[PDB]
Structures are given as structure tokens and as C-alpha cells.
């Protein structure tokens, strides 16, 4: 039990026994913690507990030292010093924010605000504590058991009594029993095995609670600015395609780390892959939280970089189908594409972390711990969607609080900004530029005259809490008959239950706003479904309308966002 203080690094024998992570706290900090919170169990070699037989005094403020032993006020010998005196807790080698991180239930937005405005070591304490709290919460849900097997994609489930039922969306991944990971959608339920298996009756499913490893590396390394490009060797022969990013690629070699804010369709993949063509000898590890973000980087690399110098790292516990054109699990290749949780312990000349709004501080820290690099480039957009915070139910998490990188991009600004959207028709670019980009995003395409908006509240029904608006889907069905070109549109809504209804009624492929992020489609049909804080989130709204290359039909519930859409209004 010999470690360093999470608040001031001072070496100590003390750990908080009431904290779920049991942080090492020094004499002067440990006191400031026990004296201000319900946390009174202090751990050393032995806990600070009354040594008198059958005594239940564990509160450090009610204990004293009797020689080399610990006793309460009722058992202490005449010659005994209190454990808590003069701003310190007795220990070898002799905070308001730490108390709030240590005691909070992570259900308030203010908990996440603090976990991002605090000191660097407190961001790791916050990130570990949050993730451990999120896992112990997965145990609170009831066990689903197979009652009947309808077919290869449908079954009926028997839930546990006394324990609540977890939300049934793709976000919540189950573990069958060890028959593989499984997912559910809406008494006929749709089952989806990450592995194909003849669903047996009696088999059960649990949300896999994974052990939270402690954090060691910071979320962001200390910034270093250099007079020249360091450890990287630029080409003089640089393809005209990537000439627009040359000044920014040099900025990347003259700093330890750099932030790139790239609104939708401004060239993030192009910038990331073009950085390899600019430093041709440099080993680049490409990382992101999701398999789809890593796969999008592989698709752009397949087009510009040699396939023999690339490798897609796939964890043996495969959950979804990912990129198959590179040699798999060769961490020895010059270009390594890998999700954060699968990263090996290696080194790199450049580390590119894409879709930075989806990262948590836990992920930022894991990347710094597994990858030791000369340069780190963080690419994403704080105006796009963050990682879901399953415990957060009160308050809204603002972009400057998503993670350390997003905090920097929203306060000091990003080091680099891609200001030209090449994907969207001008109507959409002008709407999101004013909405989330402070009028700094510019349109490359002209107005398509195929961006429509309809103010139609319809009727809101609910599959549990996931919302449906059948009259909004009815308006879409009516529109499709009059606009058959839109037969090829992707249907998007903020709710998976709305999507299930629209899939059966319209037959269009379906995507939630959160799963559509990073993807593009010629035509998009968006139904807002509700006027909630979720369906009105400006970041979700921004993602939803920036998926479209040619046209979009927005069936709106919120007068506010409807009025902001610079689209042609439709009647009915
Ligand atoms: C951080 C660089 S690395 O260790 O991942 N790649 C270098 C390398 C090492 C051994 C090899 C090889 C390439 O090809 C044959 O055997
Ligand atoms: Zn301390
Ligand atoms: Zn504590
Ligand atoms: Zn006692």
C-alpha cells in the first residue's frame, strides 16, 4: 500500500476506503476529504479501524493512535494522538473538486462539467470513477431468458422480476449464455447475434460488465511547440489534391499535438490520409472509438496509400464486421488502423485520433497509455454527437465538456479548421453554418432546390420511452408518391422505434441520427418525431441534416429549428 496522492502527488500510505477506485490521498488532502464528505474509511497497510475486539468504529475522525495501533474514543489508551488533527490524517511521509467527483452519482450534467474543468490527475480520477460507476449500473438490470424462438431474426423474451429492463436499442449490447454478443429491437422482438447461433430456449442474456482498468497517462500530453518539423520528413513532391493541407501538415510537425475541427464533408479523412503522403516515411497509427470510424479511415487509405504497408487490427472478440482489404493484426505495418479498446502497446511517428467528439476522457487517456508518439492529431467536430453517457439524466452536456480535446476546440479554438463543406447543398450548409459554426462554414455546392421542410407535429406515441410519430411517417409516404426520385432516400429520425415503423411503412433504409454520423447519402428524409431536448439537440440536428449530398426532406416538430432551416417549405 505505497503510492502517490491523486491530488498533489505527495507519497502516502493512505487510500480512501469509501471511494470506489480507492485513490491514494496524502495526510493533508485525505483530511480535507474525510472532513468534508460522508467518506470516513481510510485504508493504510491495515484499515483505520478500532483494534479493540468487537468494536465497529471505522470513522477516521472518531479514531486515535495508541502506540502503533488504532482505537476509538471508548477504547483509546491515555497516551493517544487523534488520527484527524491540524488539517492532516496520520500516515507515512507527512480538493473541493475531488470531493464532488468522489461522491457524485454521475446522473447530473454538472458532474461531467467538473470531470472536464478539473486538474489533469482529477480528470483521470473522474474518468475511472465514472466508468466504474457505469459498469456497476449494468448489474442493476434484469436477466432476459428465451421463452420462444419465432425465426432466425425474431424471438419472445422472459424478463427478471424485481429488476428493471434495459433499453432495447443497438447501444445496449448483451452477452448470451457463452453463445456470443447479441442485440434487440421492437410481443415480437428482433434478435441479432454478433455470431450466428440457433437460439435455444432457456438461453439467457446479460449486459457484459467489463472490469475498469486504472488510468495512468494524461488525457492530453503537455503541449510542445517546435521551431521546425520534428522527427518527420516532408515530401517536396506533394500531390495537388493535398496541396490545400500543406500548411496544416507542417503545423502538425511543429507541435506535440494538434486539433482539427472539420465540419461535415470538409475533408477530415482526406486530411488524415494526406498527412501520410506528406510525411511518407512516418509510421502512422489511425485510431477512433468506433469500428465504423476506423473503417472509414481504411476506405480513404485504400485509395491513396499502399495496401501492403496497411493493417487493420481486429480484437479476437469480434463484435461487428469491419474492413477486410488490409492484412489483419499485423501491428508491424507502417499504417495501423485500430479502435481505441483494441490498441496494442506500440510507438508511432504520428497518431491520428478521428471522430474526437465521440471520445471520452477515459479513451483520450488509453490512447496516451498504449501509444507513445512524436505527434498526436485529434480530428473531429465538437458540433457533432458525443459518446452516450448512460448515467446522465439531468441537464444537457455542452460540447466543451465532451472531452479534453473538445474543451480546447471550444475555448482556445482548434489549431486547424476545414471551412469548406463539399458534400451538402448550400441550403443545408447555410443552416448549420449559422446554427453551430458561427457563420464560418462555407458551401462549395450550389443550392440544390431539393431541400424541403414541413412543420407537422402529428401524434406522438411511445414504445416504452423511444418515440413514434405515425402521422409524420404518413406525410413522408404521401410525399414519396409525388416525388418518386426520393425512393432511394435514407430515412433518419432521432428514435429507433420511429425508424422501425418507417421501415415497415416506407420500406426505406433506416438510420438513427447517432448511427448516421460520419455517413453520407444523396437523399435524406428526416422526421423529428418529438419536441424533446433529445430531438432538438442542435448537435444531433446538425448531424441529421448534414448527411445529404443532394436533397433532404425535414418533417419538423420544433418551430424553432423549423424556422432556422433555410429550406423550401411544403404544404399538407
Ligand atoms: C514500431 C514499428 S514495428 O515494430 O511495428 N514494425 C517494424 C518491423 C519489425 C519486425 C519486422 C517487420 C517490421 O517486418 C518483418 O519483421
Ligand atoms: Zn495530496
Ligand atoms: Zn473518498
Ligand atoms: Zn473502539
Coordinates of C-alpha atoms in Angstrom, one line a residue, residues 78-470:
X78 CA -4.3 7.5 27.9
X79 CA -1.4 8.3 25.6
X80 CA -3.1 8.6 22.1
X81 CA -3.0 11.2 19.3
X82 CA -6.1 11.7 17.2
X83 CA -5.8 10.5 13.6
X84 CA -7.5 13.7 12.4
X85 CA -5.8 16.8 13.7
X86 CA -4.4 20.1 12.5
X87 CA -5.5 19.6 8.9
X88 CA -3.9 16.1 8.5
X89 CA -4.6 12.2 8.8
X90 CA -1.8 10.3 10.4
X91 CA 0.3 8.4 7.8
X92 CA 3.8 7.9 6.4
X93 CA 5.5 10.8 4.6
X94 CA 3.7 13.6 6.5
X95 CA -9.8 19.2 -3.1
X96 CA -13.5 20.7 -3.2
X97 CA -13.5 19.4 -6.8
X98 CA -12.1 15.9 -5.7
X99 CA -15.0 15.6 -3.2
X100 CA -17.6 16.3 -5.8
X101 CA -16.1 13.7 -8.2
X102 CA -15.7 11.1 -5.4
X103 CA -19.3 11.4 -4.1
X104 CA -21.5 12.2 -7.2
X105 CA -23.8 9.6 -8.8
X106 CA -22.9 10.8 -12.4
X107 CA -26.6 11.5 -13.2
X108 CA -26.2 15.3 -13.4
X109 CA -24.5 17.3 -16.2
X110 CA -22.5 19.3 -13.6
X111 CA -20.7 16.1 -12.7
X112 CA -19.3 15.8 -16.3
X113 CA -18.6 19.6 -16.3
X114 CA -16.4 19.2 -13.3
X115 CA -14.8 16.0 -14.7
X116 CA -13.5 18.2 -17.6
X117 CA -12.8 21.5 -15.8
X118 CA -10.7 20.0 -13.0
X119 CA -6.8 19.3 -12.9
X120 CA -5.3 16.6 -15.2
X121 CA -5.0 13.9 -12.5
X122 CA -8.6 14.7 -11.4
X123 CA -9.8 14.1 -15.0
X124 CA -8.3 10.6 -14.7
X125 CA -9.9 10.0 -11.3
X126 CA -13.2 11.3 -12.7
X127 CA -12.9 9.2 -15.9
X128 CA -12.1 5.9 -13.9
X129 CA -14.8 6.6 -11.3
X130 CA -17.4 7.3 -13.9
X131 CA -16.6 4.2 -15.9
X132 CA -16.6 2.0 -12.8
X133 CA -20.0 3.6 -11.8
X134 CA -21.4 2.9 -15.3
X135 CA -20.3 -0.9 -15.0
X136 CA -21.8 -1.4 -11.5
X137 CA -25.0 0.1 -13.0
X138 CA -25.2 -2.7 -15.7
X139 CA -25.7 -5.2 -12.8
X140 CA -29.0 -3.3 -11.9
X141 CA -30.8 -4.7 -15.0
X142 CA -32.8 -7.9 -15.2
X143 CA -31.7 -11.2 -16.9
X144 CA -33.6 -11.9 -20.2
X145 CA -34.3 -15.6 -20.9
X146 CA -35.6 -17.2 -24.1
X147 CA -39.3 -18.2 -23.8
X148 CA -39.9 -18.9 -27.6
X149 CA -38.0 -18.8 -30.9
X150 CA -40.1 -17.4 -33.8
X151 CA -37.5 -17.5 -36.5
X152 CA -33.7 -16.6 -37.4
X153 CA -34.3 -12.9 -36.6
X154 CA -37.3 -12.9 -34.1
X155 CA -37.9 -14.2 -30.6
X156 CA -40.0 -13.7 -27.4
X157 CA -38.2 -13.0 -24.1
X158 CA -38.9 -13.7 -20.4
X159 CA -37.6 -10.8 -18.1
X160 CA -36.4 -11.0 -14.5
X161 CA -38.9 -9.9 -11.7
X162 CA -37.8 -7.1 -9.3
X163 CA -35.1 -5.8 -11.6
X164 CA -35.7 -3.1 -14.3
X165 CA -35.5 -3.8 -18.0
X166 CA -32.7 -2.1 -20.0
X167 CA -33.5 0.0 -23.1
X168 CA -33.8 -2.2 -26.2
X169 CA -31.7 -0.4 -28.9
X170 CA -28.4 -1.2 -30.6
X171 CA -26.5 0.9 -28.0
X172 CA -27.1 -1.9 -25.3
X173 CA -25.0 -5.0 -26.2
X174 CA -25.9 -8.3 -24.4
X175 CA -23.9 -11.5 -23.9
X176 CA -25.7 -14.8 -24.5
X177 CA -25.2 -17.9 -22.3
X178 CA -21.2 -18.0 -23.8
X179 CA -23.0 -18.0 -27.2
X180 CA -21.7 -14.6 -28.2
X181 CA -22.8 -10.9 -28.0
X182 CA -26.4 -10.1 -29.0
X183 CA -28.6 -7.1 -29.7
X184 CA -32.5 -6.4 -29.7
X185 CA -35.2 -4.2 -31.5
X186 CA -39.1 -4.0 -31.3
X187 CA -44.9 -9.3 -28.3
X188 CA -42.4 -10.0 -31.2
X189 CA -38.8 -8.8 -30.6
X190 CA -36.0 -8.8 -33.2
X191 CA -32.8 -10.6 -32.1
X192 CA -29.3 -10.0 -33.6
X193 CA -26.3 -12.3 -32.8
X194 CA -22.8 -10.9 -33.3
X195 CA -22.2 -14.7 -34.0
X196 CA -24.8 -16.9 -35.9
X197 CA -26.4 -19.4 -33.4
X198 CA -29.6 -21.4 -33.4
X199 CA -31.3 -19.6 -30.5
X200 CA -32.1 -22.2 -27.8
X201 CA -35.0 -21.8 -25.4
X202 CA -33.6 -21.4 -21.8
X203 CA -30.5 -19.4 -23.0
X204 CA -30.2 -16.1 -21.3
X205 CA -28.7 -12.6 -22.0
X206 CA -26.7 -10.2 -19.7
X207 CA -25.1 -6.7 -20.4
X208 CA -21.4 -7.6 -20.2
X209 CA -19.9 -5.8 -17.3
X210 CA -16.2 -5.3 -18.1
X211 CA -13.5 -4.5 -15.4
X212 CA -12.4 -0.8 -15.4
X213 CA -8.6 -0.7 -15.6
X214 CA -6.9 2.3 -13.8
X215 CA -5.7 5.2 -15.8
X216 CA -2.1 6.4 -15.8
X217 CA -1.5 8.5 -18.9
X218 CA -3.0 12.1 -19.1
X219 CA -6.0 12.8 -21.5
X220 CA -3.7 15.2 -23.4
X221 CA 0.1 15.1 -23.2
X222 CA 1.8 18.5 -22.2
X223 CA 1.9 20.7 -25.3
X224 CA 5.3 21.3 -27.0
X225 CA 5.8 23.9 -29.7
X226 CA 8.9 23.5 -32.0
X227 CA 10.8 25.9 -34.3
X228 CA 11.0 23.2 -37.1
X229 CA 9.2 20.0 -38.0
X230 CA 10.4 17.3 -35.5
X231 CA 11.1 13.7 -36.4
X232 CA 9.1 13.9 -39.5
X233 CA 10.3 14.1 -43.1
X234 CA 8.2 16.1 -45.7
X235 CA 7.9 15.4 -49.5
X236 CA 8.8 18.1 -51.9
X237 CA 6.7 16.1 -54.4
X238 CA 3.2 16.6 -52.8
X239 CA 0.1 15.7 -54.9
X240 CA -2.0 18.8 -55.9
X241 CA -5.1 17.0 -54.3
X242 CA -3.4 17.6 -50.8
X243 CA -1.8 20.9 -51.5
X244 CA -4.6 22.7 -49.6
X245 CA -3.5 20.9 -46.3
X246 CA 0.3 21.5 -46.7
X247 CA 0.4 24.5 -44.3
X248 CA -1.6 22.5 -41.7
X249 CA 0.6 19.3 -42.1
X250 CA 3.6 21.5 -41.3
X251 CA 1.8 22.8 -38.2
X252 CA 1.3 19.1 -37.3
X253 CA 5.1 18.5 -37.3
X254 CA 5.8 21.7 -35.3
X255 CA 3.7 20.9 -32.3
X256 CA 3.4 17.8 -30.0
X257 CA -0.3 17.6 -30.6
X258 CA -2.8 19.4 -32.8
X259 CA -6.6 19.8 -33.0
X260 CA -8.6 19.7 -36.3
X261 CA -12.2 20.9 -36.4
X262 CA -13.8 19.6 -39.5
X263 CA -17.5 20.2 -40.0
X264 CA -19.4 17.6 -42.1
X265 CA -17.8 16.9 -45.5
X266 CA -14.9 19.4 -45.2
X267 CA -12.2 16.8 -45.7
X268 CA -11.3 15.1 -42.4
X269 CA -10.5 11.6 -43.9
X270 CA -8.7 13.4 -46.8
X271 CA -6.6 15.4 -44.3
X272 CA -5.8 12.3 -42.2
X273 CA -4.7 10.2 -45.2
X274 CA -2.9 13.1 -46.9
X275 CA -0.8 13.5 -43.8
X276 CA 0.8 10.1 -44.6
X277 CA 1.6 11.3 -48.2
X278 CA 3.1 14.4 -46.7
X279 CA 5.4 12.5 -44.3
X280 CA 5.9 9.4 -46.4
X281 CA 8.4 7.6 -44.1
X282 CA 6.4 8.3 -40.9
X283 CA 4.6 5.4 -39.2
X284 CA 1.0 6.5 -38.5
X285 CA -1.4 4.8 -36.2
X286 CA -5.0 5.7 -37.1
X287 CA -7.5 5.3 -34.2
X288 CA -11.1 6.1 -33.3
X289 CA -13.6 4.7 -30.7
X290 CA -16.0 3.0 -33.2
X291 CA -15.2 0.3 -35.8
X292 CA -17.1 2.4 -38.5
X293 CA -14.8 5.5 -37.9
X294 CA -11.7 3.3 -38.2
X295 CA -13.2 1.6 -41.4
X296 CA -13.9 5.0 -43.0
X297 CA -10.2 5.8 -42.4
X298 CA -9.3 2.4 -44.1
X299 CA -11.5 3.2 -47.1
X300 CA -9.7 6.6 -47.7
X301 CA -6.3 4.8 -47.1
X302 CA -7.1 2.1 -49.6
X303 CA -7.5 4.8 -52.3
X304 CA -4.1 6.7 -51.6
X305 CA -1.7 4.6 -49.5
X306 CA 0.0 1.3 -50.4
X307 CA -2.2 -1.7 -49.3
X308 CA 1.0 -3.7 -48.2
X309 CA 2.0 -1.0 -45.6
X310 CA -1.5 -1.1 -44.0
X311 CA -3.0 -3.3 -41.4
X312 CA -6.5 -3.4 -39.8
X313 CA -6.2 -4.5 -36.1
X314 CA -9.2 -6.6 -35.1
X315 CA -9.7 -7.9 -31.5
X316 CA -10.1 -11.7 -31.4
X317 CA -13.5 -10.9 -29.6
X318 CA -15.1 -9.7 -32.9
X319 CA -18.5 -7.8 -32.4
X320 CA -19.2 -6.3 -35.9
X321 CA -17.9 -7.0 -39.4
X322 CA -15.2 -4.5 -40.2
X323 CA -12.7 -3.6 -43.0
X324 CA -11.4 -6.7 -44.9
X325 CA -9.0 -5.3 -47.6
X326 CA -5.8 -4.9 -45.3
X327 CA -3.7 -7.7 -43.7
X328 CA -5.3 -8.3 -40.3
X329 CA -3.5 -7.9 -36.9
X330 CA -0.1 -7.0 -38.3
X331 CA 0.8 -4.3 -35.8
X332 CA 4.2 -4.2 -37.6
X333 CA 2.8 -2.4 -40.7
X334 CA 3.7 1.3 -41.4
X335 CA -0.1 2.2 -41.3
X336 CA -2.1 0.7 -38.4
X337 CA -5.9 1.2 -38.3
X338 CA -7.3 0.2 -34.9
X339 CA -10.2 1.1 -32.5
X340 CA -9.1 2.6 -29.1
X341 CA -10.0 -0.6 -26.9
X342 CA -8.0 -2.9 -29.3
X343 CA -4.8 -0.7 -29.5
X344 CA -1.6 -2.6 -28.9
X345 CA 1.3 -1.2 -26.9
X346 CA 3.5 0.4 -29.6
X347 CA 5.1 3.6 -30.9
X348 CA 4.4 5.9 -33.8
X349 CA 5.7 9.0 -35.6
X350 CA 2.1 10.3 -35.8
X351 CA -1.0 9.1 -34.0
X352 CA -4.3 10.3 -35.7
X353 CA -7.4 10.1 -33.5
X354 CA -10.5 10.6 -35.6
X355 CA -14.2 11.4 -34.6
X356 CA -12.9 13.2 -31.4
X357 CA -16.4 14.3 -30.3
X358 CA -17.2 10.6 -29.7
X359 CA -14.2 10.1 -27.4
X360 CA -14.4 10.2 -23.6
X361 CA -11.5 11.3 -21.3
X362 CA -11.1 7.6 -20.5
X363 CA -10.4 6.9 -24.3
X364 CA -8.1 10.0 -24.5
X365 CA -6.0 8.6 -21.6
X366 CA -6.0 5.0 -23.0
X367 CA -4.5 6.3 -26.3
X368 CA -1.8 8.2 -24.5
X369 CA -1.0 5.0 -22.4
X370 CA -0.9 2.5 -25.3
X371 CA 0.7 4.7 -28.0
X372 CA 4.0 6.7 -27.5
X373 CA 4.2 9.1 -30.5
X374 CA 6.3 12.1 -31.7
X375 CA 3.0 13.8 -32.8
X376 CA -0.7 13.4 -32.0
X377 CA -3.5 14.8 -34.2
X378 CA -7.1 15.0 -32.9
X379 CA -9.6 15.2 -35.6
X380 CA -13.4 15.7 -35.3
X381 CA -16.0 18.3 -34.6
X382 CA -17.5 19.5 -31.2
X383 CA -20.7 20.4 -33.2
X384 CA -21.3 16.7 -33.9
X385 CA -22.5 14.0 -31.4
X386 CA -20.7 12.9 -28.3
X387 CA -20.4 9.4 -26.7
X388 CA -23.7 8.5 -24.9
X389 CA -23.5 9.0 -21.2
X390 CA -25.8 6.2 -20.0
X391 CA -26.0 7.6 -16.4
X392 CA -26.6 11.2 -17.4
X393 CA -30.3 12.0 -17.0
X394 CA -30.4 15.6 -15.6
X395 CA -29.1 18.5 -17.6
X396 CA -27.5 18.8 -21.1
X397 CA -23.8 18.1 -21.7
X398 CA -22.3 21.1 -23.8
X399 CA -19.6 20.4 -26.5
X400 CA -16.8 22.0 -24.3
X401 CA -17.4 19.2 -21.8
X402 CA -17.4 16.1 -24.2
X403 CA -13.6 15.6 -23.5
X404 CA -10.3 17.5 -23.1
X405 CA -9.9 17.9 -26.9
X406 CA -13.4 19.3 -27.4
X407 CA -12.9 21.5 -24.3
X408 CA -9.8 23.0 -26.1
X409 CA -11.6 23.4 -29.5
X410 CA -14.5 25.3 -27.9
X411 CA -12.4 27.6 -25.6
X412 CA -9.0 28.5 -27.3
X413 CA -10.3 27.2 -30.7
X414 CA -8.9 24.4 -32.9
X415 CA -5.4 24.6 -34.3
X416 CA -6.8 23.8 -37.8
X417 CA -10.4 24.4 -39.2
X418 CA -11.6 22.9 -42.6
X419 CA -14.0 25.7 -43.6
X420 CA -15.5 24.4 -46.9
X421 CA -18.2 21.8 -47.0
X422 CA -18.0 19.9 -50.3
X423 CA -20.9 17.5 -49.5
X424 CA -24.1 19.4 -48.8
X425 CA -26.3 21.5 -51.0
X426 CA -25.9 25.2 -50.0
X427 CA -29.4 25.3 -48.1
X428 CA -28.0 22.8 -45.6
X429 CA -24.5 24.4 -45.3
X430 CA -26.1 27.9 -44.7
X431 CA -28.4 26.4 -42.0
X432 CA -25.7 24.6 -40.0
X433 CA -23.1 27.4 -40.5
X434 CA -25.4 29.8 -38.7
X435 CA -26.6 27.2 -36.2
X436 CA -23.3 25.7 -34.9
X437 CA -20.3 27.1 -36.8
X438 CA -20.6 30.9 -36.2
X439 CA -21.1 31.5 -39.9
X440 CA -17.6 30.2 -40.6
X441 CA -18.6 27.1 -42.7
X442 CA -18.9 27.8 -46.4
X443 CA -20.7 25.9 -49.1
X444 CA -18.9 24.6 -52.1
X445 CA -22.0 23.2 -53.8
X446 CA -24.8 25.5 -55.1
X447 CA -28.4 25.3 -53.6
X448 CA -29.8 22.0 -54.9
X449 CA -33.5 23.3 -54.7
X450 CA -34.2 19.8 -53.3
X451 CA -34.2 20.7 -49.5
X452 CA -37.7 20.8 -48.1
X453 CA -39.2 21.4 -44.6
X454 CA -42.7 20.7 -43.3
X455 CA -44.0 21.8 -40.0
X456 CA -46.1 18.8 -38.8
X457 CA -46.5 17.8 -35.2
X458 CA -48.6 14.7 -35.9
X459 CA -49.2 12.3 -32.9
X460 CA -46.6 11.0 -30.5
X461 CA -46.8 7.5 -29.3
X462 CA -44.2 5.6 -27.3
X463 CA -42.6 2.2 -27.4
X464 CA -41.6 2.4 -23.7
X465 CA -39.7 5.9 -24.0
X466 CA -38.5 5.6 -27.6
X467 CA -41.0 7.7 -29.6
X468 CA -43.1 7.1 -32.7
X469 CA -44.9 9.6 -34.9
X470 CA -47.1 7.7 -37.4

